[PDB]
Amino acid sequence: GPSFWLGNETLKVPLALFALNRQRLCERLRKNPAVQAGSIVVLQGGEETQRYCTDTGVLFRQESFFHWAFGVTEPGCYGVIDVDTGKSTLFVPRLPASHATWMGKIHSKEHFKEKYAVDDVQYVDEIASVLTSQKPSVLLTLRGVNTDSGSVCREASFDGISKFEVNNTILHPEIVECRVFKTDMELEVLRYTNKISSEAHREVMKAVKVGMKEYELESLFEHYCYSRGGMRHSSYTCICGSGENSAVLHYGHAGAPNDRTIQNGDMCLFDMGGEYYCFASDITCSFPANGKFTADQKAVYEAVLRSSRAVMGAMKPGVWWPDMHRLADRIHLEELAHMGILSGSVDAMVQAHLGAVFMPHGLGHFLGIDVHDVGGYPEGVERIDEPGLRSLRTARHLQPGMVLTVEPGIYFIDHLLDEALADPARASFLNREVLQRFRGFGGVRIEEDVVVTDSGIELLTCVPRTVEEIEACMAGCDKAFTPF
Amino acid sequence: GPSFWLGNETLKVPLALFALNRQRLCERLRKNPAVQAGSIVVLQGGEETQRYCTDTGVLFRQESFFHWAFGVTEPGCYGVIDVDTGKSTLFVPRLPASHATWMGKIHSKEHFKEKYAVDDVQYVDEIASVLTSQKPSVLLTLRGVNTDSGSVCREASFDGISKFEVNNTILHPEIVECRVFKTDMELEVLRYTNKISSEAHREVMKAVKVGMKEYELESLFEHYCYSRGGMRHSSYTCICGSGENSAVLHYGHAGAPNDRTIQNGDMCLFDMGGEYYCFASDITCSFPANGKFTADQKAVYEAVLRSSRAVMGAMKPGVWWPDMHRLADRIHLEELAHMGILSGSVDAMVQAHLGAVFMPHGLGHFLGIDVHDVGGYPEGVERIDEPGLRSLRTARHLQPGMVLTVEPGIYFIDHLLDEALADPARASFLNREVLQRFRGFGGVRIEEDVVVTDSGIELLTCVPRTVEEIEACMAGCD
Ligand code: PRO
Numbered sequence: 006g007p008s009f010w011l012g013n014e015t016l017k018v019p020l021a022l023f024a025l026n027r028q029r030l031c032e033r034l035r036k037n038p039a040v041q042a043g044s045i046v047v048l049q050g051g052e053e054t055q056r057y058c059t060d061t062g063v064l065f066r067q068e069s070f071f072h073w074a075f076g077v078t079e080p081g082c083y084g085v086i087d088v089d090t091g092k093s094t095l096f097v098p099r100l101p102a103s104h105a106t107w108m109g110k111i112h113s114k115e116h117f118k119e120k121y122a123v124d125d126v127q128y129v130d131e132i133a134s135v136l137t138s139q140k141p142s143v144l145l146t147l148r149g150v151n152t153d154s155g156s157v158c159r160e161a162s163f164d165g166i167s168k169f170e171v172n173n174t175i176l177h178p179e180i181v182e183c184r185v186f187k188t189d190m191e192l193e194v195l196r197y198t199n200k201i202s203s204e205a206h207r208e209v210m211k212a213v214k215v216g217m218k219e220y221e222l223e224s225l226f227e228h229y230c231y232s233r234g235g236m237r238h239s240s241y242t243c244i245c246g247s248g249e250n251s252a253v254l255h256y257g258h259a260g261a262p263n264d265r266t267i268q269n270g271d272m273c274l275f276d277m278g279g280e281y282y283c284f285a286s287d288i289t290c291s292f293p294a295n296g297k298f299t300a301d302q303k304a305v306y307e308a309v310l311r312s313s314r315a316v317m318g319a320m321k322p323g324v325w326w327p328d329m330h331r332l333a334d335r336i337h338l339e340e341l342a343h344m345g346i347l348s349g350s351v352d353a354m355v356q357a358h359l360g361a362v363f364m365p366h367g368l369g370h371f372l373g374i375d376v377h378d379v380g381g382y383p384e385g386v387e388r389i390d391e392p393g394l395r396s397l398r399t400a401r402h403l404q405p406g407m408v409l410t411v412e413p414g415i416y417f418i419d420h421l422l423d424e425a426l427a428d429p430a431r432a433s434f435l436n437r438e439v440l441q442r443f444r445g446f447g448g449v450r451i452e453e454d455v456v457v458t459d460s461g462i463e464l465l466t467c468v469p470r471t472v473e474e475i476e477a478c479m480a481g482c483d484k485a486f487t488p489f
Numbered sequence: 490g491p492s493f494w495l496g497n498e499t500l501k502v503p504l505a506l507f508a509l510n511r512q513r514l515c516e517r518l519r520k521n522p523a524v525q526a527g528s529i530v531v532l533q534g535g536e537e538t539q540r541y542c543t544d545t546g547v548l549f550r551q552e553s554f555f556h557w558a559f560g561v562t563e564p565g566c567y568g569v570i571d572v573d574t575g576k577s578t579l580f581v582p583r584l585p586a587s588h589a590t591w592m593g594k595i596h597s598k599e600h601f602k603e604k605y606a607v608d609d610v611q612y613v614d615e616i617a618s619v620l621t622s623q624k625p626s627v628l629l630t631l632r633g634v635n636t637d638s639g640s641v642c643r644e645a646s647f648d649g650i651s652k653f654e655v656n657n658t659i660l661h662p663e664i665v666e667c668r669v670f671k672t673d674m675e676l677e678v679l680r681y682t683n684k685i686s687s688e689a690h691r692e693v694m695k696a697v698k699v700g701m702k703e704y705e706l707e708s709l710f711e712h713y714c715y716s717r718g719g720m721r722h723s724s725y726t727c728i729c730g731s732g733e734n735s736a737v738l739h740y741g742h743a744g745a746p747n748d749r750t751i752q753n754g755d756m757c758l759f760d761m762g763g764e765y766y767c768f769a770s771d772i773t774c775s776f777p778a779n780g781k782f783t784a785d786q787k788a789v790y791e792a793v794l795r796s797s798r799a800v801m802g803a804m805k806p807g808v809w810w811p812d813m814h815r816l817a818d819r820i821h822l823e824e825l826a827h828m829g830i831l832s833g834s835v836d837a838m839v840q841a842h843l844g845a846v847f848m849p850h851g852l853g854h855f856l857g858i859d860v861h862d863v864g865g866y867p868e869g870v871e872r873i874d875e876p877g878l879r880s881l882r883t884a885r886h887l888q889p890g891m892v893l894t895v896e897p898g899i900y901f902i903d904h905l906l907d908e909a910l911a912d913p914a915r916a917s918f919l920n921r922e923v924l925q926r927f928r929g930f931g932g933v934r935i936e937e938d939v940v941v942t943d944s945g946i947e948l949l950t951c952v953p954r955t956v957e958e959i960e961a962c963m964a965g966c967d
Pocket residue numbers: 254255366367369370398412
């Protein structure tokens with residue numbers, strides 16, 4: 006069959022991946038007692054957008070559910086699936102003659118059918134007529150809440166949909182559940198996005214020099230990912246925090262745009278991941294800017310390496326993800342005590358939620374078409390209202406096929422530390438005279454992408470992780486990647 | 490005064506630039522008979538967005554009018570200007586404590602006042618109170634039609650605005666007209682964006698090899714612009730057309746994403762331009778993939794070079810831009826006839842609009858904070874309803890301070906050629922025996938950015954342009 010490919014050494018992705026997703030969705034829907042025979046899934050693809058009121062086009066990236074189901078890269082499409090038969094129909098825009106001048110070849114419907122391996126292709130202006138002819142019982146559309154953004158996913162609509170009976174509640178939980186569990190074909194793509202992003206992280210580590218701006222490494226990373234990986238998009242805005250900025254969790258946005266000069270003695274925390282064909286990667290490397298860990302940097306870093314490997318070693322089906330977050334907390338606290346930053350009973354530290362002072366975010370999250378992937382809090386799975394844990398993007402138990410980030414970290418965040426020092430229940434554990442030395446340290450995060458297997462996990466990421474490995478990698482002299 | 494700067498060798502842009510823009514806008518409004526005392530300009534900045542319903546953040550780029558007035562890079566702001574005094578007030582978001590954890594330091598109002606060199610800073614939720622206290626006669630908000638997109642620019646709004654007198658018709662044509670005329674400080678930034686983008690184009694020319702994918706050069710260009718120029722954004726999606734794709738004017742979009750392998754014998758047409766602090770550049774370089782012009786490639790290229798230089802040599806204040814388009818048309822037609830592609834009277838070809846078959850787009854456009862900049866068709870300026878000319882993005886007369894692209898091109902576009910061959914009014918001009926050789930040629934576009942000056946123009950762009958220069962640079966000449 007056909008495959009998506011950007012040539013050179015980039016991954017060929019079979020369009021059968023999407024056909025399998027459509028089949029898996031129908032199979033789930035058929036088992037749902039509420040789903041009527043003759044139902045049709047109706048999805049609306051993303052449309053082209055501009056900057057505000059200007060004609061400056063924004064580069065189009067497909068809506069994630071529509072991509073999962075069809076893998077279609079063109080804007081302005083719709084896609085439907087007959088639940089009972091699994092038959093797929095793609096609706097494509099009927100384009101004007103001038104498109105041939107400005108945008109490119111005007112492809113036939115047959116071209117798209119062959120390209121996307123769907124059962125039928127029609128024009129978007131015919132969708133109402135085509136669906137009517139099929140005499141469906143009900144149209145199943147997509148509406149639900151994303152539990153990371155809190156945004157409501159908006160329903161497909163088209164001229165004349167009012168004449169149909171529409172259900173917008175059944176589909177969202179079902180398609181979300183399918184996305185939670187990755188097929189072998191999806192895993193091949195995620196192995197690839199991790200491979201390229203890992204290589205790019207290595208190139209960045211080799212290239213970092215004191216005196217560079219953070220954004221120079223962001224630029225290099227994205228260039229590696231695009232030119233070598235065919236990754237036109239990143240999975241998210243590159244987080245390139247040096248020095249105190251490594252304590253800022255989602256540093257790098259427009260308000261704090263990776264514009265600090267890297268200084269001797271800084272820790273770097275680089276959280277970056279390319280996207281290939283709308284599949285994510287999400288990797289964080291932490292390392293000394295000057296290629297040599299200080300004693301303090303080694304201690305903090307190896308604390309996070311310990312919780313990372315402890316969690317990965319414990320992960321397997323049936324394990325409760327919040328228990329892993331708590332494991333990481335307990336390990337961080339043990340290590341910070343060994344360093345002399347903390348004193349006292351670690352049991353008591355845990356009871357006082359002291360772990361969340363140093364790791365205020367969740368241990369990790371589902372990953373897939375979206376970097377913060379869907380399905381972390383389905384109905385019946387509650388958010389835990391405690392420091393740290395309340396930021397977890399899922400409270401589910403692990404099952405095979407789930408893809409998760411494992412990203413413990415330790416940070417020195419002034420407002421959290423100040424809060425803890427003011428609280429007598431936590432202050433007693435903190436040794437101010439030692440902690441003071443770590444103000445402005447920043448932080449360390451070690452982020453791997455893994456897949457749950459029948460017996461444990463498979464690690465997708467491949468970057469240097471021990472202190473020795475990192476120092477060796479940064480001292481490497483290969484002019485493997487030297488632009489101009 | 491403070492300046493915007495991304496370190497290293499990047500340009501320091503004084504915030505005085507935006508102060509001058511506010512002053513110029515007030516001075517223009519004070520002369521407008523529709524404007525009364527006590528008026529306040531109210532603008533609303535862009536907000537953060539995500540991909541669809543996900544929490545995947547889209548990199549924030551400021552709305553262009555707001556940038557022009559304030560130079561503010563943060564999302565969620567408003568900005569007001571007292572017309573009579575020129576006093577500026579920036580309104581910034583009142584952030585949650587957790588912002589300290591996830592997004593970075595919670596800067597004080599005073600930090601922002603110092604950063605942006607405005608007269609006052611307040612929190613956004615206080616805008617109704619602050620404006621109420623100033624007892625304005627009327628709020629002047631921004632609403633109008635962009636004549637390139639057709640989209641309506643939407644008005645500032647805030648909770649409680651309905652208690653104010655609001656006018657949304659006066660401001661738009663005035664602030665557009667200010668944007669049309671670049672200050673010397675703005676020209677400094679456009680010289681810089683052209684400098685970096687020119688350097689990046691030269692790196693691309695040096696790096697291109699047969700067998701590469703087009704997107705590899707897109708990647709390299711953007712990497713040069715960001716790492717060396719501090720240009721995090723491009724002004725528009727890179728158009729990297731090789732071979733037949735060079736005949737596709739806005740090739741490179743999601744539907745045709747620069748994924749062709751460059752072949753020996755191809756012409757490359759690379760239209761790319763970095764953006765610095767929301768100021769554009771827009772440059773096109775055309776060159777042979779293999780670094781050696783064939784006779785046919787040299788002929789088409791030098792035809793476009795001739796019209797580029799004829800137009801640049803003719804541009805001066807008072808010149809009507811549509812006349813420049815027609816000049817380019819005539820030159821292309823003359824040269825296409827000198828090549829044996831066309832025969833007959835060039836006067837007759839022009840009368841038949843034959844030029845538009847080969848250049849179906851406009852000669853060039855205003856450029857500024859937007860690559861297709863505002864103000865091309867103010868009230869009274871009409872779009873000329875003829876092939877080619879109707880695609881012009883302005884029909885104005887040139888005046889000092891305007892910044893324009895000069896981008897003639899010649900393309901071999903099958904459905905336009907075939908139309909002409911079916912049209913008795915045009916078909917006889919075409920020599921199929923020669924034209925057949927150029928089917929699949931693609932096209933050549935030579936795009937320069939220029940400033941209209943008192944005496945003519947200032948050329949901003951600096952890339953190799955002659956055949957000799959191009960072949961030299963592609964063989965790595967310093
Ligand atoms: O937002 C999250 O869940 C992770 C933790 C910090 C970086 N990204």
